[PDB]
Structure formats: structure tokens, C-alpha cells
Nucleic acid binder design. Structure first.
Ligand code: LTP
Ligand code: CA
Ligand code: CA
Length: 342
DNA sequence: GGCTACAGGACTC
DNA sequence: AGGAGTCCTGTAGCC
């Protein structure tokens, strides 16, 4: 298998750039304003000008404002970004039919059937960039290798506005010299559990006993890392089918009062049903973030599709069950729908 | 022992 | 300290 991965660079910021090029060269911070008070919320993304000075995704807008007060701060406009993304994804469809759209700004192409060797792939990646640069004036980063993981790793090493192939020898060099924390799916909690155990690099998972590693990180993550380390990871590029849709909103004040949480719950439901479109869910989950930022949720599956009016009703009962079974105040509340009708 | 549904955890961002 | 979505795991109810 040969896999080409494309990752759009600083995507939300770059779209804002394209809709207003006067922004180009200045630091740009796309934000999610929670609506508690002036500048409550977080940075969803920043362009590389802003990232130099430390303003990056996840930090609070307040923290960012300290560092770059003259930077342009823009509210997230996801609908816009999604339409730019859908257009870019169809351009990619012209270069392969086996396409896996992984997020709003990431896609894998199986380019076995389209390419013979890696240097031919690298020219294919130059074509794809320039097409996207011409058509949408969006820079992207391309990663090419033997599988999805190492193509993503390639693009991680090359962004922004980069191209890179990791050949079959490079893969073997990475197996034993890549900080295992740079492997997709290995976050901070799992990184630690690997150190607190011995494993700093992928090759190390072959020397530890399986049950010991399985004990720490779980069967699936152990099987995954092992398969990567043996160079036997080969998972297919397959079309991703959306499995759930939902909305969570931040309330202006924390609360355990049913009657003042309800309006936010109901808006989240109205917004979620719009977004559902023609999809009919058989399952609903109410999700709350407590004041100490812990996530609590209750859900029910139905032997039939959930009408909006049933959503309204079941959601209050599920919310009541949260209030009853968990004693902490609620800060954020929404819903999530799943198990769609086929 | 092994299957299915839930509620939480971890990760991608 | 926002918002969205996925896969995985421990537990319980049931063959
Ligand atoms: N915590 C984060 C991280 C990234 N993002 C958004 C969501 C995702 O679609 C987009 C991708 O990130 P971006 O292109 O800015 O940079 P990178 O590719 O993530 O380095 O940023 C977010 O909303 N929240
Ligand atoms: Ca990305
Ligand atoms: Ca990106």
C-alpha cells in the first residue's frame, strides 16, 4: 500500500485570511467565545504568525490577549470553514476513489492503483498542492508512506506548507528512533503510562511482555503499538460515515436548577436537529460538564427513531437523572444523537 | 466465557 | 479552561 495524507495548514485562520487577505502577515486567532463575559472562551486555532509567540489551540482567549493584544481575534465561523473544506475534499476525489476523510481538514488517499513508487507519489503530492493552492488559495501539507499512521507522521514533520515521504527504511529508523509520544493516538496520559513502564520508542513494545503492556494501556492500544512496531500495521483507507451529531453550550451561570438549564438544553436540541438534517437517530445522550469541568452523561436508545418532541421529553428525564445521580453543579449542557436509521 | 447496552476515559483535535 | 466527534473499556444483565 502507498498512502498520501493531506492536512490543510492552520485551516480556520487560513480561510479567514482568504475571505480577508488584509490579514495576511499579521497574527490571527480564531476563537470560541463561551459568552460568559468579554473574552471568556478558548482559541480554536491560530496562524503561524500567532503561534510563534505562543498563542495556540486550547489556551484561553484572555491568556492569548496578554501575549498579542494587537493580533486580530475572530469568532469561529464553522459553517464557512465546512463549505471551503467540502470543496477541497472533492478536488482530492479527482486523484483517488479510495479516500478517507478524517476531519474537516484531513484526508487520506490510497494511491496504490495510481502510483508505482515513492518519488512518483511525491510528484502526485506536488500536483495536489498546486491544484488546491490555485483553486482555493489554501496551503496544505502532504505526507506519504506505507500506511495511514506514517503518512500522518510525515505531514506532522513537514507542516506547514510541506511535502514528505517516509520510505520503508525511514519507517524502520522511526520504529526505533521516534519518540513514541509522536505516534497518533498516544496522548499525555498514555505517554506517561509508557514511560512509567519503560517504553520510550515503538521498538520497545516488542521486548516487554504483552500482558504487562496490555495491563497499562489496554488491549487495543497495545495491539496497535505492537503492530506498528513489527511493521505489520496495514489498516485500509475507508470512507468515514458520521456516527453521532450533537451540540453543547456554556450556560451564563453554573446551576442545578432544572428550569434555568432547560432553555440551553432545548436550544442544543433545536441546533442538533437542524444539523441532523435527514438523519433520524434511535439514541440520545444528554451531556453535562460540571463546574469542576468533569463530563457526565446519560442516554437512552429507542427501538425506533427519535422525533424532536420525544427528544425534548427524553432529554429532560436524562437531565433529571444526572442531577439525581451526581451532586455537582452544571456549567455546560447539551445533547448528542446517534445510531442513525439505515 | 462471551455477547450486547451503558457511562466514563482518552484522544483527535 | 470551547466545542465536536471517535474508539475503547469496565460493568451489569443475559444467553
Ligand atoms: N483543540 C483544538 C485543536 C485544533 N482545532 C481546530 C479543529 C481542526 O479542524 C483544526 C485543525 O488544526 P490547524 O489546521 O489549525 O493546525 P494543525 O493542523 O492542528 O496543526 O483546528 C480545534 O478546534 N481545537
Ligand atoms: Ca489537522
Ligand atoms: Ca491542519
Amino acid at each position: 500500500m502507498i498512502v498520501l495524507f493531506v492536512d490543510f495548514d492552520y485551516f480556520y485562520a487560513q480561510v479567514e485570511e482568504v475571505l480577508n487577505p488584509s490579514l495576511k502577515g499579521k497574527p490571527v486567532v480564531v476563537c470560541v467565545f463561551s459568552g460568559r463575559f468579554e473574552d471568556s472562551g478558548a482559541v480554536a486555532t491560530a496562524n503561524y504568525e500567532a503561534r510563534k509567540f505562543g498563542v495556540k489551540a486550547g489556551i484561553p482567549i484572555v491568556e492569548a490577549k496578554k501575549i498579542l493584544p494587537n493580533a486580530v481575534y475572530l469568532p469561529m465561523r464553522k459553517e464557512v470553514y465546512q463549505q471551503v473544506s467540502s470543496r477541497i475534499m472533492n478536488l482530492l476525489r479527482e486523484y483517488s476513489e479510495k479516500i478517507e476523510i478524517a476531519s474537516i481538514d484531513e484526508a487520506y488517499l490510497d494511491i496504490s492503483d495510481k502510483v508505482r513508487d515513492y518519488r512518483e507519489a511525491y510528484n502526485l503530492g506536488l500536483e495536489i498542492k498546486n491544484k488546491i493552492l490555485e483553486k482555493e488559495k489554501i496551503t496544505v501539507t502532504v505526507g506519504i508512506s506505507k500506511n495511514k499512521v506514517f503518512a500522518k507522521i510525515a505531514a506532522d514533520m513537514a507542516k506547514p506548507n510541506g511535502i514528505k515521504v517516509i520510505d520503508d527504511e525511514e519507517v524502520k529508523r522511526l520504529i526505533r528512533e521516534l519518540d513514541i509520544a509522536d505516534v497518533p493516538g498516544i496522548g499525555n496520559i498514555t505517554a506517561e503510562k509508557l514511560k512509567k513502564l519503560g517504553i520510550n520508542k515503538l521498538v520497545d513494545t516488542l521486548s516487554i511482555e504483552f500482558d504487562k503492556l496490555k495491563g497499562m494501556i489496554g488491549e487495543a492500544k497495545a495491539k496497535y503499538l505492537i503492530s506498528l512496531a513489527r511493521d505489520e500495521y496495514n489498516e485500509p483507507i475507508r470512507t468515514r460515515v458520521r456516527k453521532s451529531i450533537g451540540r453543547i453550550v456554556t450556560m451564563k451561570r453554573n446551576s442545578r436548577n432544572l428550569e434555568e438549564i432547560k432553555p440551553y438544553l432545548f436550544r442544543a436540541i433545536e441546533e442538533s436537529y437542524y444539523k441532523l438534517d435527514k438523519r433520524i437517530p434511535k439514541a440520545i445522550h444528554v451531556v453535562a460538564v460540571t463546574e469542576d469541568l468533569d463530563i457526565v452523561s446519560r442516554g437512552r436508545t429507542f427501538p425506533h427513531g427519535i422525533s424532536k418532541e420525544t427528544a425534548y421529553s427524553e432529554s429532560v428525564k436524562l437531565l433529571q437523572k444526572i442531577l439525581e445521580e451526581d451532586e455537582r453543579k452544571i456549567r455546560r449542557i447539551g445533547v448528542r444523537f446517534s445510531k442513525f436509521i439505515e
